[PDB]
Design a protein around this motif. Structure first.
Motif, mmCIF file in Angstrom:
data_model
loop_
_atom_site.group_PDB
_atom_site.id
_atom_site.type_symbol
_atom_site.label_atom_id
_atom_site.label_comp_id
_atom_site.label_asym_id
_atom_site.label_seq_id
_atom_site.Cartn_x
_atom_site.Cartn_y
_atom_site.Cartn_z
ATOM 1 N N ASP A 8 0.870 -1.143 0.000
ATOM 2 C CA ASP A 8 0.000 0.000 0.000
ATOM 3 C C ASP A 8 0.919 1.208 0.000
ATOM 4 O O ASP A 8 1.882 1.286 0.765
ATOM 5 C CB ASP A 8 -0.932 0.046 1.203
ATOM 6 C CG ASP A 8 -1.937 1.183 1.084
ATOM 7 O OD1 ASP A 8 -1.531 2.341 1.303
ATOM 8 O OD2 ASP A 8 -3.113 0.923 0.738
ATOM 9 N N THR A 9 0.607 2.146 -0.868
ATOM 10 C CA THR A 9 1.429 3.336 -1.004
ATOM 11 C C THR A 9 1.103 4.433 0.005
ATOM 12 O O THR A 9 -0.055 4.684 0.343
ATOM 13 C CB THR A 9 1.317 3.853 -2.464
ATOM 14 O OG1 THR A 9 1.804 2.837 -3.348
ATOM 15 C CG2 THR A 9 2.159 5.137 -2.661
ATOM 16 N N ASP B 254 -4.934 1.841 -4.782
ATOM 17 C CA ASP B 254 -3.543 1.658 -4.389
ATOM 18 C C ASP B 254 -3.369 0.406 -3.545
ATOM 19 O O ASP B 254 -2.281 0.118 -3.048
ATOM 20 C CB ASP B 254 -3.018 2.915 -3.662
ATOM 21 C CG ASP B 254 -3.358 2.932 -2.189
ATOM 22 O OD1 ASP B 254 -4.487 2.541 -1.830
ATOM 23 O OD2 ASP B 254 -2.482 3.335 -1.397
#
Ligand SMILES: O=c1ccn([C@@H]2O[C@H](COP(=O)(O)OP(=O)(O)OP(=O)(O)O)[C@@H](O)[C@H]2O)c(=O)[nH]1
Ligand SMILES: O=c1ccn([C@@H]2O[C@H](COP(=O)(O)OP(=O)(O)OP(=O)(O)O)[C@@H](O)[C@H]2O)c(=O)[nH]1
Ligand SMILES: [Mn+2]
Ligand SMILES: [Mn+2]
Ligand SMILES: [Mn+2]
Ligand SMILES: [Mn+2]
Ligand SMILES: [Mn+2]
Ligand SMILES: [Mn+2]
Ligand SMILES: [Mn+2]
Ligand SMILES: [Mn+2]
Ligand SMILES: [Mn+2]
Ligand SMILES: [Mn+2]
Lengths: 531, 531
Positions: free
Chosen positions: B220-221, B318
């Protein structure tokens, strides 16, 4: 086979049906011969059943086969998608008949768990059952017209056949994306529904002027829905399947064709079996697309059989206009008869034999015709008009009775450039809105398949967008149009145009006095009444 | 460039913002540690601005270029159409922010002449002006969470950036048909939004079992929207243009990208300029599709850079899950670091470094994870679950304050098979509906982008359709799931599961006593409480 086979049970109403125009001062302000205005009711359903019931004989030939191959080839370039239950729900019209299964159009639109769960169940049934005939209800329509003394006097009620709301939402999931894209691809510039009134006029006028010696004719089939055969419906299904579709869509389209579109049982509002249908149902999603494709296929073939030269066609359901190169007076007459015999062999005989016309203004299709006037600079401007009788009768009816629909507002918008909409309808209704200070109250208006919520003050912008500014300054209308309007006024007992111009001057003053948006309407909508 | 440049003006609210859970008897019936539950407010907007503001450095390589060429090739097989103003209006969500131009979502949905005329004008402007930055409003979101003592305690409010309602309807005309079809074609089985909870589980479990020695990880960004660059947004636009589109659609997509998607000015609820955006706006039509395509492109490239073997990816915005063939303990750890460095070069660094996992149950993405239980016959059944903390906190908040949205109902439906939704949420809320005899009153429920009107009695049918009948008989849950639920209860001060089983027996009896639909809910929803 027979278009319908009946049981004897009657086509019953599901609410009161008014047939007479109520003596009203406001309505009499517009029209005095109230006895000439009437509305159809289930009472005349029997007469209609008689007219729409007959055996269909159809013989196809290579002209037909060739055109169909050409249509399938174009159809094969179309890709369409399935709508989800939610998308189909959101696209369901607000005032459609509620379902027999406990929910209505508002529940569908609001994604009620009840509507949604039931629709998923109907969808699953369509995919798993491809044979059981689906139920439909048959009703008489209640529409307003002006008597036609030169014949049957009053027309019998039209009939509408439709499946339950749940099924209707499933038709959208399977075919909404198809019926909104396929016709245009297959038929090109001949698909009439892609055009606004002005674009339709543009296409007809440019087509007309492109011929060295233009000849044209309108064609309309007697009881078209009844002339559509099982083979025609299966041919339509074969065209839909040429598209690149999702597997469930293909399965649902096939099932809907077998269980609903080709025919099935008819139930009245009482729940009794009225009979069996073997032709087009008027209330299904594919009625318009199907009728237009079928009329286009038969007419294209018929043009070839009649060897008409450089034909250009415009098609809206069973309403057809063909413009071609004249081969001479007697040659054209003979070719039209051959055209008609081909249409008849294909199963679509005419209500009235078509007649060659050499004057574009004289061709009427979709109850409309092209006409000419002049803009401010004096330049010729073509626009779409129609005989004002029905629009006027309906306006008087809506003046006398609050109606869920304001057809008069729909006519004002679609026919904004016409002499009668401007001088009579606009003046009449704005005078009323002023007197009741309801100039700002939004009214429901059905136009082009959708129901809009229109604020009268928005009319100048609506008309400008649809017709352009010249719509507010057209003058020097044609003698034929002026005489038709004048005659219609005499027939209906509506005040002559002199009176309307006078009444419009008053309405205009009243609008200007208010300033703001009201003054804008006065300035644009009634600039014709000045000086 | 900088993701945002600010002016100093503040992000202001446009209504009261509650931050504390109100001491309530009913709510305390569910959760006792009320001080741990809170809602974000514009008060913490500053902290968020700090986190989302940073320079983006991006270096692309052939892995990236190769994947993009492959995506464009698939994109080129897509055909999409323009929606008409009317279609876009009908698909507009009921509770979206009203327009600054005098109309709201209800006017749009009802095809008001005011909304419709304005939208036609915005559309014409998009086609004729392809440069002027379009205005957007920036607001702090008001969301409910449980405190996290092991760190920042309370989270700062998220920020939402969106254009005016008129523009939003125009985004649908240009791109609705694209964003609903393109992702699936380009990404195939990796497109996470095509799956229901059970289908998502199915894809993950089958993928996991297909590997000889499976290894997986979630990624996950950190502040993904902020990491999206101008080049990323233009690359997205280039992918959209590979589709077979109508000319106006192409023009509108280009204009929207230049004037809105790549960035633009930010205005607060007061009308003051807050700053300038150079990254993804969270409230545009393409936010989800764009984020998913971009995350998929960067992650696909990163998998190649890290030489991960037989990778299979699942992408929801994302949120990324990658399952592959393990190369060994230390080999996997090193490959994940290379994967992360590639993602970082492409501009998307992680919130927390990803970690290799060899237990499918331990991989959390989209705040969810796969788990196993057994059906009636004792067969293993996989289903989707999640940590119940947020769902519980929100349920207590909605218990204490009437809310336009019933997230708890949404959790009951999406997580019907889970131990906590069944034992805690269903019991708690049905007990309340019974006491207030509102068992038949429909409630608004936001699920999967749509707002539904759900009647509680419809729950058994909803759950059966979505999860299948086994959802009513799962037992023997995993120790890890049971312990997580138990711990969460202890943390929030909610009664242990023993108490809920007892309370559920009572609710069940009360439902059966009523017969009909109520008894059905008792039988299916609470069959687990019997004996
Ligand atoms: O009994 C009828 C006849 C026609 N219609 C509907 O009228 C529409 C065509 O509208 P038209 O204005 O072309 O009607 P028409 O008189 O040519 O119709 P036919 O009798 O030839 O069929 C079509 O959508 C058709 O389903 C009815 O609803 N009921
Ligand atoms: O400040 C924010 C951050 C995120 N979002 C929205 O949350 C959705 C993603 O939902 P997630 O649950 O994936 O959020 P996240 O924490 O990963 O988000 P990032 O901070 O990495 O961006 C996306 O649709 C995004 O636009 C906001 O609305 N505001
Ligand atoms: Mn006809
Ligand atoms: Mn007719
Ligand atoms: Mn007709
Ligand atoms: Mn007609
Ligand atoms: Mn007619
Ligand atoms: Mn993130
Ligand atoms: Mn986060
Ligand atoms: Mn995320
Ligand atoms: Mn989240
Ligand atoms: Mn989160």
């Amino acid at each position: 086979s027979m278009s319908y086979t009946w049981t004897g049970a009657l086509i019953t109403p599901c609410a009161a049906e008014e047939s007479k125009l109520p003596i009203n001062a406001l309505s009499n302000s517009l029209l005095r011969h109230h006895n000439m205005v009437y509305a159809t009711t289930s009472r005349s359903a029997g007469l209609r059943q008689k007219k729409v019931t007959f055996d269909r004989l159809q013989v196809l030939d290579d002209h037909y086969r060739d055109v169909l191959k050409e249509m399938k080839a174009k159809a094969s370039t179309v890709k369409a998608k399935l709508l989800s239950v939610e998308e189909a729900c959101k696209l369901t019209p607000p005032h459609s008949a509620k379902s027999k299964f406990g929910y209505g159009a508002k529940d569908v639109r609001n994604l009620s768990s009840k509507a949604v769960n039931h629709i998923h169940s109907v969808w699953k049934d369509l995919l798993e059952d491809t044979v059981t005939p689906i139920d439909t209800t048959i009703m008489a329509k209640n529409e307003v017209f002006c008597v036609q003394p030169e014949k049957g006097g009053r027309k019998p009620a039209r009939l509408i056949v439709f499946p339950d709301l749940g099924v209707r939402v499933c038709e959208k999931m399977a075919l909404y994306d198809v019926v909104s894209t396929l016709p245009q691809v297959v038929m090109g510039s001949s698909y009439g529904f892609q055009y606004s009134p002005g674009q339709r006029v543009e296409f007809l006028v440019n087509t007309w002027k492109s011929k060295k010696n233009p000849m044209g004719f309108s064609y309309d089939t007697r009881c078209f829905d009844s002339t559509v055969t099982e083979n025609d419906i299966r041919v339509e299904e074969s065209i839909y399947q040429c598209c690149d579709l999702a597997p469930e869509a293909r399965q649902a389209i096939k099932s809907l064709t077998e269980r609903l579109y080709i025919g099935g049982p008819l139930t009245n509002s009482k729940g009794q079996n009225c009979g069996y249908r073997r032709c087009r149902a008027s209330g299904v999603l594919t009625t318009s697309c199907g009728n237009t494709l079928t009329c286009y296929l038969k007419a294209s073939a018929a043009c070839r059989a009649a060897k008409l030269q450089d034909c250009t066609m415009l098609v809206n359901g069973d309403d057809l206009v063909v413009i071609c190169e004249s081969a001479g007076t007697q040659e054209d007459a003979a070719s039209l008869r051959v055209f008609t015999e081909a249409m008849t062999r294909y199963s679509a005989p005419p209500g009235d034999p078509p007649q060659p016309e050499y004057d574009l203004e004289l061709i009427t299709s979709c109850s409309s015709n092209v006409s000419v006037a002049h803009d401010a600079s004096g330049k010729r401007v073509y626009y779409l008009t129609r005989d004002p009788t029905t629009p006027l009768a309906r306006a008087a009816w809506e003046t006398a009775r609050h109606t869920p629909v304001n057809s008069w507002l729909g006519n004002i918008i679609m026919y904004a450039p016409t002499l009668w909409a401007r001088m009579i309808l606009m003046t009449h209704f704005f005078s009323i809105l002023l007197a009741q200070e309801q100039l700002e109250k939004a009214l429901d208006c059905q136009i082009y398949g959708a129901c809009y919520s229109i604020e009268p003050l928005d009319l100048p912008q609506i008309i400008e967008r649809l017709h352009g500014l010249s719509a507010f300054s057209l003058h020097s209308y044609s003698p034929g149009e002026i005489n038709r309007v004048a005659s219609c006024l005499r027939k209906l007992g509506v005040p002559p145009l002199r009176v309307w111009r006078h009444r419009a001057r008053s309405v205009r003053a009243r609008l200007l006095s208010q300033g703001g948006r009201a003054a804008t309407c006065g300035k644009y909508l009634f600039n014709w009444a000045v000086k």
